[PDB]
């Protein structure tokens, strides 16, 4: 031990501000707690790490394994100092050695790698990198593709069964059986987190909350360590079991010691969470779970949860679901918002208190037009969720789905009620133009449901024709909701298949391009992890959504209307 | 090499 400080262990009430001070002026609460735990701990020696025959084993020699704790290989009789691998056994909340901080193996390393997950017996690992970053290598690929189907590194044989490519990780399905021995096949679990940079943090803390609430859920048939490794096997590896460990700890004492956790890290491995944001990181993990808590519902379950999640007993209170949506933390003014607030801007605005955040606004190639930027379920597709255009507008409208190439257009309202205009009427029967720009409805495809329109659009730079199509959902006043879903999702259907996976292709529209449209991109991202996943984190997925635009479902009957139609068409 |  050393001189650092003697925090005081946050409890679950006074951790959102505790949090909310310890962050003020940039932090330097934080920065002075976490600069004050030590790289490493001169004391535990280190002289197995450091021996000649095994400096090709390490990836960095800025990082090396104590020697108490490091893990060890089988010695094979006569090749010197063949029991040393990078690797440290970490422990938990209580489990010891629960898991098994390793250094991304290197080529030189992959078969001591997959040695070391048969003779720890590990059924788990949890691979928080990439193999390459900034065309630098940070980790050897120890596993065969999905089409090289099986490859044996030394006596381990590793054969892949399944590869699910998710958003921000990929789940792969192992089977391993050492063959110079009658022992057999066992089945491995491999996550790979992509959306977390070397040195880094990912893009949200929930992000993190979520591969922790996967692995948590895998198979551990053998109560063996858990590989959780990265590059050097000590920063964004470290830093994750901060949050696994430390929410156990919420769950058991409702209070963490993070600041001692990460030292008792440093204390089994060499600088282990590396970087006052990592640091920072794993509080904001904390934060945000204790704060929202669990909200991401299985297929399995959706149906009978719902149920309960709706009755709210003692009549008298609200119900659980009416408890979640009260707990989404509207971001008011969230950001900046002058843009679309300047003077001659402001007479831009179908709706004066629904502006795009400066943050994420369209770019009109800047020049202005009220419509802003919304994340994908796969990132980084991106939407265009736009209002309806005004007659004072009608042309800037164009000009960014040409810019931006939008392949389909969606419009939820009428052009208006009566007298009052809901949305301008960006379209004509001619051949309507509008600057560098001309549009010619070529098509107008009529049904019980919602109509097609077909445009073929060019500018002066003719030979260029870009065929753009435009579906209008009339059911659907900002009154009542959706009256007949199942057709709304249907909707979807067609324009989902019109759209072309993976170069902003789409763009949706209405009034402000949050009232209704929320409520469509929210069922889009939902609609897609539905069936790229089976789950449904309905909470975050609206979360996300208040984030970037004023106006998103602002109401518990499009709250409460997410689940209905994701449940109803999924029995 | 150096990990920082």
């Known amino acids: ?571 | 090499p150096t990990y920082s």
């Open chain 1, 1 to 571: 031990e050393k001189q650092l400080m003697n925090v005081e262990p946050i409890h679950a009430d006074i951790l959102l501000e505790t949090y909310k001070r310890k962050i003020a002026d940039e932090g330097r609460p934080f920065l002075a707690e976490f600069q004050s735990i030590p790289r490493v701990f001169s004391k535990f020696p280190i002289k197995e790490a450091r021996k000649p025959f095994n400096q090709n084993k390490n990836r960095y020699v800025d990082i090396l394994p104590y020697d108490y704790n490091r893990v060890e290989l089988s010695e094979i009789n006569g090749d010197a100092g063949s029991n040393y691998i990078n690797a440290s056994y970490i422990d938990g909340f209580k489990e010891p050695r629960k898991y098994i901080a390793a250094q991304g193996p290197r080529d030189e390393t992959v078969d001591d790698f997959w040695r070391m997950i048969w003779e720890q017996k590990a059924t788990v690992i949890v691979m928080v990198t990439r193999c390459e970053e900034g065309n630098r290598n940070k980790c050897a690929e120890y596993w065969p593709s999905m089409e090289e189907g099986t490859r044996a590194f030394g006596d381990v044989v590793v054969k892949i069964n399944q590869h699910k490519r998710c958003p921000d990780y990929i789940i792969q399905k192992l089977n391993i059986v050492n063959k110079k021995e009658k022992a057999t096949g066992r089945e491995v679990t491999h996550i790979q987190f992509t959306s977390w940079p070397d040195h880094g943090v990912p893009e949200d803390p929930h992000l993190l909350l979520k591969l922790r609430r996967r692995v948590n859920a895998f198979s551990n048939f053998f109560s063996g360590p858990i590989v959780v490794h990265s590059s050097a096997g000590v920063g964004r590896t470290g830093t994750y079991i901060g949050i696994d460990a430390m929410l156990e700890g919420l769950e058991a004492e409702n209070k963490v010691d993070v600041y001692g956790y990460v030292v008792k890290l440093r204390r089994q491995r060499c600088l282990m969470v590396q970087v006052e944001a990592q640091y920072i990181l794993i509080h904001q993990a904390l934060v945000e779970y204790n704060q929202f808590g669990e909200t991401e519902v299985n297929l399995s379950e959706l149906h009978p949860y719902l149920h309960n999640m709706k009755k709210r007993d003692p009549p008298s209170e609200p119900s659980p679901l009416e408890a979640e949506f009260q707990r989404l933390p509207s971001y008011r003014s969230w950001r900046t918002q002058h843009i679309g607030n300047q003077e001659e801007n402001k007479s831009k605005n179908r709706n004066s208190n629904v502006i795009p955040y400066d943050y994420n606004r369209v770019p009109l190639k800047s020049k202005y037009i009220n419509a802003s930027f919304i994340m994908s379920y796969w990132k980084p597709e991106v939407m265009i969720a736009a209002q309806g255009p005004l007659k004072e507008t009608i042309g800037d409208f164009w000009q960014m789905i040409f810019q931006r190439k939008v392949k389909v257009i969606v419009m939820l309202t009428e052009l208006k009620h009566g007298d009052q205009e809901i949305c301008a009427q960006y379209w004509g029967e001619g051949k309507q133009t509008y600057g560098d720009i001309e549009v010619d409805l070529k098509d107008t495809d009529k049904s019980s449901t919602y109509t097609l329109r077909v445009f073929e659009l060019r500018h002066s730079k003719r030979k260029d024709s870009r065929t753009v199509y435009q579906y209008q959902y009339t059911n659907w006043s900002v009154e009542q909701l959706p009256a007949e879903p199942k057709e709304l999702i249907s909707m979807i259907q067609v324009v989902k298949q019109k759209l072309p996976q993976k170069n902003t292709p789409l763009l949706i529209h209405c009034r402000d391009g949050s009232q209704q449209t929320g409520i469509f991109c929210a069922l889009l991202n939902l609609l897609e992890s539905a069936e790229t996943e089976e789950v449904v984190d309905i909470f975050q997925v609206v979360k996300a959504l208040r984030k970037a635009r004023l106006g998103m479902v602002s109401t518990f009957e499009q709250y409460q209307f997410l689940y209905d139609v994701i449940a109803s068409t999924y029995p």
